[PDB]
Design an enzyme around this catalytic site. Structure first.
Site, PDB file in Angstrom:
ATOM      1  N   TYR C 366     -10.884 -45.795 -26.885  1.00 46.11           N
ATOM      2  CA  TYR C 366      -9.658 -46.420 -27.363  1.00 46.11           C
ATOM      3  C   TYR C 366      -9.432 -47.822 -26.812  1.00 46.11           C
ATOM      4  O   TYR C 366      -8.464 -48.476 -27.214  1.00 46.11           O
ATOM      5  CB  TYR C 366      -8.464 -45.522 -27.033  1.00 46.11           C
ATOM      6  CG  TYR C 366      -8.569 -44.146 -27.655  1.00 46.11           C
ATOM      7  CD1 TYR C 366      -9.248 -43.120 -27.010  1.00 46.11           C
ATOM      8  CD2 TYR C 366      -8.004 -43.876 -28.894  1.00 46.11           C
ATOM      9  CE1 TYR C 366      -9.350 -41.866 -27.572  1.00 46.11           C
ATOM     10  CE2 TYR C 366      -8.104 -42.622 -29.467  1.00 46.11           C
ATOM     11  CZ  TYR C 366      -8.778 -41.620 -28.801  1.00 46.11           C
ATOM     12  OH  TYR C 366      -8.882 -40.368 -29.363  1.00 46.11           O
TER      13      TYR C 366
HETATM   14  C1  F43 Z   1     -14.939 -38.305 -28.256  1.00 44.63           C
HETATM   15  C2  F43 Z   1     -13.636 -37.866 -27.501  1.00 44.63           C
HETATM   16  C3  F43 Z   1     -13.437 -38.919 -26.375  1.00 44.63           C
HETATM   17  C4  F43 Z   1     -12.437 -39.943 -26.960  1.00 44.63           C
HETATM   18  O1  F43 Z   1     -12.222 -41.052 -26.547  1.00 44.63           O
HETATM   19  N1  F43 Z   1     -11.810 -39.351 -28.045  1.00 44.63           N
HETATM   20  C5  F43 Z   1     -12.345 -38.015 -28.413  1.00 44.63           C
HETATM   21  C6  F43 Z   1     -12.587 -37.912 -29.961  1.00 44.63           C
HETATM   22  C7  F43 Z   1     -11.364 -38.500 -30.712  1.00 44.63           C
HETATM   23  C8  F43 Z   1     -11.433 -38.493 -32.246  1.00 44.63           C
HETATM   24  C9  F43 Z   1     -12.156 -37.283 -32.858  1.00 44.63           C
HETATM   25  C10 F43 Z   1     -12.522 -37.491 -34.357  1.00 44.63           C
HETATM   26  C11 F43 Z   1     -13.915 -36.904 -34.643  1.00 44.63           C
HETATM   27  O2  F43 Z   1     -14.125 -35.711 -34.323  1.00 44.63           O
HETATM   28  O3  F43 Z   1     -14.754 -37.645 -35.185  1.00 44.63           O
HETATM   29  C12 F43 Z   1      -9.913 -38.618 -32.622  1.00 44.63           C
HETATM   30  C13 F43 Z   1      -9.515 -37.994 -33.990  1.00 44.63           C
HETATM   31  C14 F43 Z   1      -9.460 -40.129 -32.597  1.00 44.63           C
HETATM   32  C15 F43 Z   1     -10.068 -40.978 -33.702  1.00 44.63           C
HETATM   33  N2  F43 Z   1     -11.034 -41.853 -33.433  1.00 44.63           N
HETATM   34  O4  F43 Z   1      -9.654 -40.846 -34.883  1.00 44.63           O
HETATM   35  C16 F43 Z   1      -9.269 -37.920 -31.431  1.00 44.63           C
HETATM   36  N3  F43 Z   1     -10.118 -37.670 -30.443  1.00 44.63           N
HETATM   37 NI1  F43 Z   1      -9.669 -36.250 -28.942  1.00 44.63          NI
HETATM   38  N4  F43 Z   1      -8.210 -35.390 -30.112  1.00 44.63           N
HETATM   39  C17 F43 Z   1      -7.447 -34.344 -29.868  1.00 44.63           C
HETATM   40  C18 F43 Z   1      -7.462 -33.555 -28.682  1.00 44.63           C
HETATM   41  C19 F43 Z   1      -8.460 -33.627 -27.714  1.00 44.63           C
HETATM   42  C20 F43 Z   1      -8.775 -32.577 -26.623  1.00 44.63           C
HETATM   43  C21 F43 Z   1      -9.252 -31.292 -27.353  1.00 44.63           C
HETATM   44  C22 F43 Z   1      -9.399 -30.152 -26.325  1.00 44.63           C
HETATM   45  C23 F43 Z   1      -9.969 -28.913 -27.003  1.00 44.63           C
HETATM   46  O5  F43 Z   1     -10.244 -27.968 -26.183  1.00 44.63           O
HETATM   47  O6  F43 Z   1     -10.164 -28.799 -28.238  1.00 44.63           O
HETATM   48  C24 F43 Z   1      -9.827 -33.242 -25.733  1.00 44.63           C
HETATM   49  C25 F43 Z   1      -9.221 -33.884 -24.496  1.00 44.63           C
HETATM   50  C26 F43 Z   1      -8.803 -32.760 -23.516  1.00 44.63           C
HETATM   51  O7  F43 Z   1      -9.761 -32.089 -23.013  1.00 44.63           O
HETATM   52  O8  F43 Z   1      -7.587 -32.547 -23.264  1.00 44.63           O
HETATM   53  C27 F43 Z   1     -10.339 -34.327 -26.701  1.00 44.63           C
HETATM   54  C28 F43 Z   1     -11.484 -35.011 -26.418  1.00 44.63           C
HETATM   55  C29 F43 Z   1     -12.099 -36.160 -27.134  1.00 44.63           C
HETATM   56  N5  F43 Z   1     -11.444 -36.879 -27.984  1.00 44.63           N
HETATM   57  C30 F43 Z   1     -13.584 -36.412 -26.967  1.00 44.63           C
HETATM   58  C31 F43 Z   1     -14.423 -35.425 -27.819  1.00 44.63           C
HETATM   59  C32 F43 Z   1     -14.264 -33.973 -27.275  1.00 44.63           C
HETATM   60  C33 F43 Z   1     -15.409 -33.085 -27.820  1.00 44.63           C
HETATM   61  O9  F43 Z   1     -16.548 -33.514 -27.610  1.00 44.63           O
HETATM   62  O10 F43 Z   1     -15.129 -32.048 -28.399  1.00 44.63           O
HETATM   63  N6  F43 Z   1      -9.445 -34.601 -27.750  1.00 44.63           N
HETATM   64  C34 F43 Z   1      -6.300 -32.654 -28.434  1.00 44.63           C
HETATM   65  O11 F43 Z   1      -5.961 -32.182 -27.314  1.00 44.63           O
HETATM   66  C35 F43 Z   1      -5.427 -32.254 -29.584  1.00 44.63           C
HETATM   67  C36 F43 Z   1      -5.229 -33.347 -30.668  1.00 44.63           C
HETATM   68  C37 F43 Z   1      -6.593 -33.917 -31.041  1.00 44.63           C
HETATM   69  C38 F43 Z   1      -6.590 -35.204 -31.876  1.00 44.63           C
HETATM   70  C39 F43 Z   1      -6.547 -34.982 -33.422  1.00 44.63           C
HETATM   71  C40 F43 Z   1      -5.124 -34.706 -33.918  1.00 44.63           C
HETATM   72  O12 F43 Z   1      -4.141 -35.019 -33.249  1.00 44.63           O
HETATM   73  O13 F43 Z   1      -5.020 -34.143 -35.045  1.00 44.63           O
HETATM   74  C41 F43 Z   1      -7.890 -35.861 -31.468  1.00 44.63           C
HETATM   75  C42 F43 Z   1      -7.821 -37.439 -31.481  1.00 44.63           C
HETATM   76  C1  LIG Z   2      -5.462 -50.391 -23.738  1.00 39.33           C
HETATM   77  C2  LIG Z   2      -5.293 -51.627 -24.650  1.00 39.33           C
HETATM   78  O1  LIG Z   2      -6.548 -51.983 -25.273  1.00 39.33           O
HETATM   79  P1  LIG Z   2      -7.563 -53.087 -24.692  1.00 39.33           P
HETATM   80  O2  LIG Z   2      -8.112 -52.516 -23.472  1.00 39.33           O
HETATM   81  O3  LIG Z   2      -6.764 -54.361 -24.466  1.00 39.33           O
HETATM   82  O4  LIG Z   2      -8.720 -53.193 -25.692  1.00 39.33           O
HETATM   83  C3  LIG Z   2      -4.278 -51.316 -25.765  1.00 39.33           C
HETATM   84  N1  LIG Z   2      -4.619 -50.152 -26.601  1.00 39.33           N
HETATM   85  C4  LIG Z   2      -4.005 -48.972 -26.442  1.00 39.33           C
HETATM   86  O5  LIG Z   2      -3.131 -48.753 -25.616  1.00 39.33           O
HETATM   87  C5  LIG Z   2      -4.460 -47.877 -27.374  1.00 39.33           C
HETATM   88  C6  LIG Z   2      -3.319 -46.958 -27.663  1.00 39.33           C
HETATM   89  C7  LIG Z   2      -3.708 -45.934 -28.725  1.00 39.33           C
HETATM   90  C8  LIG Z   2      -5.019 -45.226 -28.443  1.00 39.33           C
HETATM   91  C9  LIG Z   2      -4.779 -44.267 -27.272  1.00 39.33           C
HETATM   92  C10 LIG Z   2      -3.787 -43.143 -27.556  1.00 39.33           C
HETATM   93  S1  LIG Z   2      -3.772 -41.854 -26.249  1.00 39.33           S
HETATM   94  C11 LIG Z   2      -4.164 -52.510 -26.659  1.00 39.33           C
HETATM   95  O6  LIG Z   2      -4.921 -52.549 -27.649  1.00 39.33           O
HETATM   96  O7  LIG Z   2      -3.329 -53.375 -26.359  1.00 39.33           O
HETATM   97  O1  LIG Z   3     -11.545 -37.182 -24.236  1.00 44.47           O
HETATM   98  S1  LIG Z   3     -10.497 -38.168 -24.101  1.00 44.47           S
HETATM   99  O2  LIG Z   3      -9.377 -37.604 -23.333  1.00 44.47           O
HETATM  100  O3  LIG Z   3     -10.975 -39.413 -23.594  1.00 44.47           O
HETATM  101  C1  LIG Z   3      -9.878 -38.467 -25.693  1.00 44.47           C
HETATM  102  C2  LIG Z   3      -8.568 -37.826 -26.006  1.00 44.47           C
HETATM  103  S2  LIG Z   3      -8.175 -37.892 -27.839  1.00 44.47           S
END
Ligand code: F43
Ligand SMILES: C[C@@H](OP(=O)(O)O)[C@H](NC(=O)CCCCCCS)C(=O)O
Ligand SMILES: O=S(=O)(O)CCS
Ligand SMILES: O=S(=O)(O)CCS
Ligand SMILES: [Mg+2]
Ligand SMILES: [Mg+2]
Ligand code: NA
Ligand SMILES: [Xe]
Ligand SMILES: [Xe]
Ligand SMILES: [Xe]
Ligand SMILES: [Xe]
Lengths: 547, 243, 442, 547, 110
Positions: C366
């Protein structure tokens, strides 16, 4: 029964208490009607444009578990989660558009300039003539110059200008088509508070076209509003179309007596006025109109604000403006689906009501340590006793946000003060973290760890009452699962107190308007209507496009 | 060091994981080749890829006082191992791991999430650590999983065999033998020969070793001394931020 | 002096230099070397004369991948660097023999410029340094080659970039440590919008010198932000001394006692022992086989805990020779020490919170990036008031080459030019000497 | 014949040379089909919503003169001016959306991180697999996590990712569905210049969904792009889904190798990236694709850019973002209707071609004084000889912009240098002001009077080559009738020189794409198509709304 | 006294604090000067105007010799008067955030 039992039984074949199920034999994405629609659509889209698009064989195979339906809380509508994505939900897009295209502009300085600097008379009759003029000009039509080309009135049918005032006689003298009647929209005790706050002031509620707001940005609203107010002031009060005094109306309309929905943001997250990051938590609570229709149920009022904020702050703001892609739909739906947060918060309300009585508890750390700890333990124990509930809100972040919001709102129900409610929010996080040896995602509790020390700080970028904080508060600027709930904690003590507003009475009145497209009295009901694809938004281009 | 307060089995299990003088109970034997196969960063017998030349190839009192780990001396890459722990009485839990890792291991980069917990360090030192993480009571082949991605399952219901959900099914329970075999590495690539991970711990031993509080085990609200310390930190943090 | 505290000062080798120095002798408001460091940062500009020549020769000005075909100008700027720099200094200086400094580096390919202090005595902020430097070299280049009126605007674009169409000096061939005032997260943040890579680059990857300089910049900004005013002033001075200045050799001794085999947990145990040994903390209550520690001086406990935090970073990330684990150290040192003692962690949780997002935004998708690209004005790492960024400077200093966005990639012009000033490269030396010289004036 | 004679004959019954006509007897707004449609629509709008709206009796009565039709230049399409209002023209709205939702992101640093930090190989086969992955994820679909809810593929059918490179052999090895073929889109000499500029670099052209871009803002684009690039990098190259090296891709995609269409703006006009105010005149010339299809007619190339910029900068940017209401439709249409600017500019081209030859004139003030004076006198004399022309472009601002644009573009045709062309622009203004003792509106020549001295200045906020200037250049930040024409002057010398691009070759390649919705090779033809209500835009919500 | 903080027409019902700040302006301004000043003999100046309704504050030049720009003047003044008001009336931890909002407004949300 717990309020979430019905939703859990609709999701799974097992009873909510059962710890075991079967996986991998559901057919993957074929279990879902929605995924099937997406697979067929992606095939047609890819063929039509000549570029591959949606493909269920890319990456990991969705659907090894039950792809759950979600009950929109307080309704009987069950939809798959994709239907609550803001891109797929026209009611959610229109809710934000109605906020983005709205601005409040006073008439008090303007009327003073007319009578003092211009030496002309202002009466309720002239105000009506101005209002008839401005409701022609505001959507994009001319009043002065020759050979002007104008906007199609049907494309901009959602743009209009209304006024309100605390003086019942003045309000009764203006044409009621342009008047937001405070006495009709709010109950008596709320109406008296709002009318006493407004007084003899006259305030415009300006809404610019949705099609313009979508084409441009939020900072367009106050400028578009000011241009057409100024043109209507020139026309209605017979000014020269450009003399010295005309400059006063422009500064008044653009800076002096204007209330933006959102203030502008710093450079790293560079954005103009009227974007979600600039809307403080108190404004969002006042934008939500649950307070004037559910004033006997402070839990219902507070959670409608949570629903308002969770969708806007997490799905649209943080999930798109600040990130994007698949987004954060379920990070937010946890706060307004399956009646889960409702069950937790109704528990804390009754606990506070039975032990202290609403707003009767001391406003100190003792009330925080008691209520927040008790409500937190209740929330976490429901996940431990209902495995289907834990599988439902599978993300720890989801669970941390839901549990702490109930603990925060309940603590605010007890103290009648939002700052102790916020302190209960962070205590819930600390207890939650220690109980399950987990909390949220990798960076969920940045603010949560900064939380306790910054609740009552008074330093430059640390100290603020919760009503004044917002998505630009430094600790809050990045992360999901907080901002929408902070708005609910802001509403909680005022809902228990019966206050007509949380932070701004003008904002509260400005959205008590039946000519809005989105119904802010029933936020969750509107979300369900958009999920079923039954919501009719503004700003469509169908009139100027082929069949 | 006291590490953690409380009078429950959970609190003592958290102290045991953190205390480097507590010898972790070894529950299984895993070969060096299988650990390299499970990690999936390199093939067994393949040389360690280098991110920078060895250290031997500036003036700093800190550099001269802090002995680098063997992988940093050689310039190994920083690779990872990541575990998912079921909320149904898995022995280790996310914050327990990170807290324990930074008490027991040098040069550790630990991260905690609800559904996964990761440690990154130099590759050859990770393999030595991963052996202890996989062989000892840190790991249960049914309620825990090695997952580099698609970690969904920590909060889900178990399957008929008591196995935690895995979207990629990296760990397969054998109904005929009662033992768990790992058929893929932590990223989900199929292995040439599966790795035996032993039998799942029975429900009696899981509750004896677990570090999660639950109402159907040891509830957090009943460990009043542990809750008191957390409430104390919340109050002291609040007062410190004010004055 | 407002405070009774005194500290013993040491060098980057653990040797005692001066004993029993009043705390406020290290204060940015009083220390003359910190004043020299802050004022030097405001007025120092690096000029890339080679970059300007290449931009003009190729008409590649105004940002990445930008070029205006037909605008090329072939000027031997580097060959005439002596005459150009001499003409520029004549316009930069206010009077003769003032503190104007213009030095050529790399055989004329670079230029170190220090704008005279007299220009800043009548200025509101710090933008006079790049703006006066840019226009002086633009005019000097035009005069040197008699660039025509019709071509001179390309020299301006080559030096300062797309400004003012862009808000920043987008594509400029000058560099400073501070960024434009518009990019501050808030008022008073300018000394925080200094990239960690910038500090590590000009400290030449010395751990203690990078830690001292980062703490000097961070805590000095706490005074400009108003955080170090009144009730909180002593806490920030104590943190500056013990965490960044190696007060009483506490950071050094903790690193020494745990450098060969120690971990974060072992550094915590020794730090808690030292605090109990020095009367900073005392057993307040006994639970079941658990001692609850208390203190009558939270600011001093915070300073001791902050020293161990820096030492735990040096032990953990030093052993790995990789900076990335600093986000984990900043988190769990504070998490472990709270349940080890029952006392609040450094900055009352704000370091632990900063570390949570810093871990996230350096291991995810992010935003953020590597540890070196962060700073006190970053949205991710602005929350702790001076106690977290110095540990990142120490960690990036220990990184043996595992970062894609190292100071060599983002701070190359800073590493070459700003390291030449001895005040910035070795700030621990001058700040300790200056505190000793003023110890009887505090 | 003059190029505007036919349009003038279509507008009025009188001969173009006649100085007299009749007024007041045309029926007011009843003379117009479009005004009649608006009056009927305003009645339906007011009836349905219960608030007055469009009313032809408010203010002064439109239509005392001929309500003119307009010929879209280079076409035979005649429309009323209301059809060229951006609110009523879906082609104009989609042109801005296509720019707003675009960002250029390099793959060079990312591929370096893959091979060095991760130690994995990058080949054309891995790039194809990544591109197939990113074109699934970019519209909003999942590749890693379980139980993800996604965007409807049909609502986001316009979002995709393509790549280009100067290495013909590498380009041929990537799946051609994802490749912008430079050799097919540009002529030979232009393709060789662009391929030489890009070299071995590989660059992505990312376009996010229009429906998201309209719901959110321009600053969303680079963020939305980076998230899905990061997820696809995780999936395609088998990273851990969140390790240390993953942070490099995020910083690379968000900052390190990203090219925004527009840079962010300062606080007074607070706006994030990818808003019109941040788009420099050189980028706007390169976004327009007339250069690769009309490369033999430098006048046609320059004026298509004028049309692009006049609509974007004056109608959408200055006419809505910065003001609003009826807007500045005819302020801009003066520059792309009735072939008026075409006639003036073709004259100056032929004058320069015969006297100097294109790009052969000296680059000094003598060429400015000669070419700008000759073209200005020719342009102003056309209004003096054709009263129908002077009544057509009735605003002095309109005329000043058209005359100076021809004088500026012609001077740039002569010198091959945009800065002397800009000097000719301001000289045209000074001569125009003295000839007719009038120029533009009250504040038209703020920049025009600052102009001459700031053309060749080198001071901090004054000196910049014209290609680098834009709507944020201090003198230019406020006023209509300049910015779109400045973009044409920036294109003018490069069109005469045959240059493939004006300021950024990556921007030029990024819009040579047949999968765009708006056809940037035929800007004026697209404006006419949208005015006729025949344009099919993206981002509509019809699929998720009732019938 | 009215809980009207944070911008035009803004108010938080239930947060009202009745403090006689103007009646104690002499003690408050003296306490703030002690925090604003660097030393007892620098150029710090704090003067009351309008019978204590206003205060002229001149932050000492020593703070600007070590500052990058000029924001130290409002930020040091604001926090000194916030702390001085809190110490003067012993405002509790739970109410002090209202004094901060009354002095500096909605910053840092705005
Ligand atoms: C690649 C990451 C690292 C990162 O920066 N973001 C990810 C992935 C990103 C992608 C997944 C889309 C896809 O599958 O292609 C999106 C949708 C954000 C996006 N780019 O649109 C997202 N997560 Ni994440 N992500 C979520 C969540 C979570 C929870 C899931 C835990 C579980 O046991 O299933 C954990 C974090 C944690 O451990 O607390 C998590 C991790 C992660 N999150 C791990 C991938 C985990 C894995 O390999 O399975 N998400 C959630 O906790 C719930 C909401 C959910 C979001 C989608 C929605 O809100 O509908 C999504 C929000
Ligand atoms: C951290 C900072 O990004 P940079 O490190 O400056 O690239 C900031 N983004 C965010 O806070 C991303 C918020 C949404 C994605 C995370 C949701 S948990 C921003 O773009 O101003
Ligand atoms: O796995 S990470 O906590 O970095 C992403 C949450 S959507
Ligand atoms: O009369 S003014 O020139 O101010 C308005 C021009 S649209
Ligand atoms: Mg409805
Ligand atoms: Mg077409
Ligand atoms: Na928009
Ligand atoms: Xe309420
Ligand atoms: Xe530095
Ligand atoms: Xe940090
Ligand atoms: Xe061209």
């Amino acid at each position: 029964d717990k309020l979430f039992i019905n939703a859990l039984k609709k999701k799974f074949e097992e009873s909510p208490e059962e710890k075991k199920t079967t996986f991998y034999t559901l057919g993957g994405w074929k279990q879902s009607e929605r995924k099937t629609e997406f697979v067929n659509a992606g095939k047609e889209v890819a063929a039509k444009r000549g570029i591959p698009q949606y493909n269920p064989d890319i990456g990991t195979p969705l659907g090894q578990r039950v792809l759950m339906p979600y009950q929109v809380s307080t309704t009987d509508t069950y939809v798959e989660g994709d239907d609550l994505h803001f891109v797929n939900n026209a009611a959610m897009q229109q809710m934000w558009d109605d906020i983005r295209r709205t601005v409040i502009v006073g008439l008090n300085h303007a009327h003073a300039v007319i009578e003092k600097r211009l030496g002309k008379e202002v009466t309720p009759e002239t105000i009506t003539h101005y209002l008839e003029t401005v409701n022609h000009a505001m959507p994009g039509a001319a009043v002065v110059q020759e050979h002007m080309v104008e906007t199609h009135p049907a494309l901009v049918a959602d743009s209009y200008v209304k006024v309100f005032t605390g003086n019942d006689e003045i309000a009764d003298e203006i044409d009621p088509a342009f008047v937001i009647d405070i006495n009709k929209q709010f109950p008596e005790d709320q109406a008296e508070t709002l009318k006493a706050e407004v007084g003899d002031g006259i305030w415009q509620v300006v809404r610019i076209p949705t099609i313009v707001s979508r084409t441009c940005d939020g900072a367009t609203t106050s400028r578009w509003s000011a241009m057409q107010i100024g043109m209507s002031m020139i026309s209605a009060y017979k000014q020269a179309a450009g003399e010295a005094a005309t400059g006063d109306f422009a500064y008044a309309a653009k800076h002096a007596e204007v209330i933006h929905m959102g203030t502008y943001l710093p450079v790293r997250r560079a954005r103009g006025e009227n974007e979600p990051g600039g809307v403080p938590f108190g404004y969002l609570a006042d934008i939500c109109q649950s307070s004037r229709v559910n004033y006997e149920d402070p839990v219902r009022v507070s959670l409608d604000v949570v629903a308002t904020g969770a969708m806007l702050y997490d799905q649209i703001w943080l999930g798109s403006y600040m990130s994007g892609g698949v987004g954060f739909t379920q990070y937010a739906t946890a706060a307004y689906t399956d009646n889960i947060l409702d069950d937790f918060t109704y528990f804390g309300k009754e606990y506070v009501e039975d032990k202290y009585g609403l707003c009767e508890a001391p406003n100190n750390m003792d009330t925080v340590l008691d209520v927040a700890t008790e409500v937190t333990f209740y929330g976490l124990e429901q996940y431990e006793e209902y495995p289907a509930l834990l599988e439902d809100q599978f993300g720890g972040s989801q669970r941390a946000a839901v549990v702490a919001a109930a603990a925060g709102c309940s603590t605010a129900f007890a103290t009648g003060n939002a700052q102790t409610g916020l302190s209960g929010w962070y205590l819930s996080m600390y207890l939650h973290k220690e109980q399950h040896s987990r909390l949220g995602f990798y960076g969920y509790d940045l603010q949560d760890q900064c939380g306790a020390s910054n609740v009552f700080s008074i330093r430059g970028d640390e100290g603020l009452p919760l009503e004044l904080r917002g998505p630009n508060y430094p600790n809050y600027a990045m992360n999901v699962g907080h901002q929408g709930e902070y708005a609910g904690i802001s509403q909680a003590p005022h809902a228990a107190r019966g206050d007509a507003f949380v932070f701004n009475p003008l904002v509260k009145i400005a959205f008590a308007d039946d000519n809005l497209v989105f119904d802010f009295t029933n936020v969750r009901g509107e979300f369900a209507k958009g999920a079923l694809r039954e919501f009719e938004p503004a700003g469509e281009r169908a009139l100027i496009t082929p069949a | 060091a006291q590490y953690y307060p409380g009078t429950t089995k959970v609190a003592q299990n958290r102290r045991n994981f953190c205390n480097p003088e507590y010898e972790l109970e070894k529950l299984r034997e895993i070969s060096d080749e299988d650990v390299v196969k499970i990690l999936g960063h390199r093939a067994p017998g393949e040389e360690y890829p280098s991110v920078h030349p060895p250290l031997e190839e500036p003036e700093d009192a800190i550099r001269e006082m802090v002995e680098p780990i063997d992988g940093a001396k050689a310039g190994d890459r920083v690779r990872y191992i990541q575990f998912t722990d079921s909320m149904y009485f898995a022995p280790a839990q996310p914050y327990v791991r990170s807290r324990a890792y930074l008490c027991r291991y040098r040069g550790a980069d630990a991260g905690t999430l609800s559904g996964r917990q990761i440690i990154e360090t130099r590759e050859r030192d990770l393999e030595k650590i991963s052996k202890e993480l996989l062989e000892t009571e840190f790991f249960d082949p049914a309620r825990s999983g090695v997952r580099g991605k698609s970690v969904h399952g920590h909060s889900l219901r178990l399957d008929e065999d008591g196995m935690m959900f895995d979207m990629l099914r990296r760990q397969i329970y054998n109904k005929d033998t009662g033992r768990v075999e790992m058929v893929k590495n932590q990223i989900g690539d199929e292995l040439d020969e599966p790795v035996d991970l032993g039998e799942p711990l029975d429900e009696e031993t899981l509750m004896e070793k677990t570090t999660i509080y639950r109402v159907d085990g040891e509830a957090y609200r009943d460990d009043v001394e542990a809750v008191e310390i957390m409430q104390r930190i919340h109050v002291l943090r609040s007062q410190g931020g004010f004055n | 002096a407002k405070f009774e505290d005194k500290v013993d000062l040491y060098d980057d080798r653990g040797n005692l230099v001066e004993e029993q120095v009043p705390l406020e002798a290290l204060s940015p408001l009083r220390n003359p070397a910190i004043k020299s460091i802050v004022q030097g940062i405001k007025r120092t500009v690096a000029v890339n004369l080679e970059g300007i020549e290449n931009a003009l020769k190729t008409a590649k000005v105004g940002g990445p991948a930008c070029k205006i075909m037909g605008r090329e100008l072939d000027l031997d700027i580097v060959g005439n660097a002596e005459s150009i720099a001499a003409a520029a200094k004549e316009m930069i200086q206010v009077t003769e023999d003032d503190d104007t400094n213009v030095e050529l580096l790399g055989g004329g390919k670079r230029a170190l410029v220090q704008v005279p202090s007299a220009r800043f005595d009548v200025a509101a902020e710090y933008s006079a340094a790049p703006l006066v430097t840019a226009t002086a070299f633009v005019q000097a280049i035009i005069n040197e080659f008699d660039v025509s009126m019709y071509d001179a605007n390309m020299v301006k674009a080559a030096v300062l970039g797309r400004y003012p169409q862009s808000v920043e000096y987008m594509g400029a061939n000058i560099a400073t440590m501070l960024d434009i005032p518009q990019k501050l997260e808030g008022p008073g943040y300018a000394l925080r919008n200094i990239m960690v890579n910038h500090v590590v680059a000009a400290t030449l990857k010395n751990t203690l010198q990078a830690a001292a300089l980062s703490t000097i910049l961070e805590q000095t900004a706490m005074f400009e932000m108003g955080d170090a005013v009144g009730a909180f002033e002593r806490m920030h001075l104590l943190g500056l001394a013990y965490q960044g200045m190696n007060a009483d050799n506490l950071v050094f001794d903790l690193v020494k006692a745990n450098g060969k085999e120690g971990t974060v947990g072992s550094v915590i145990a020794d730090l808690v022992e030292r605090a109990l040994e020095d009367g900073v903390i005392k057993v307040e209550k006994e639970l079941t086989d658990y001692k609850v520690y208390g203190t009558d001086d939270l600011a001093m406990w915070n300073a001791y805990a902050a020293a161990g935090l820096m030492a735990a970073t040096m032990v953990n990330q030093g052993a790995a020779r990789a900076a990335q684990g600093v986000s984990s150290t900043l988190l769990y040192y504070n998490d472990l020490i709270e349940f080890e003692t029952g006392l609040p962690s450094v900055d009352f949780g704000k370091v632990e919170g900063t570390a949570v997002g810093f871990s996230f935004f350096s291991h995810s998708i992010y935003g953020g990036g590597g540890p070196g690209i962060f700073n006190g004005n970053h949205i991710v790492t602005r929350h702790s008031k001076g106690f977290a960024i110095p540990c990142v400077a120490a960690a990036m200093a220990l990184d043996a080459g595992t970062q894609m966005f190292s100071p060599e990639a983002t701070s190359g012009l800073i590493k070459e030019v700003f390291s030449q000033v001895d005040e910035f490269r070795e700030p621990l030396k001058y700040v300790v000497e200056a505190a000793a010289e003023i110890k009887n004036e505090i």
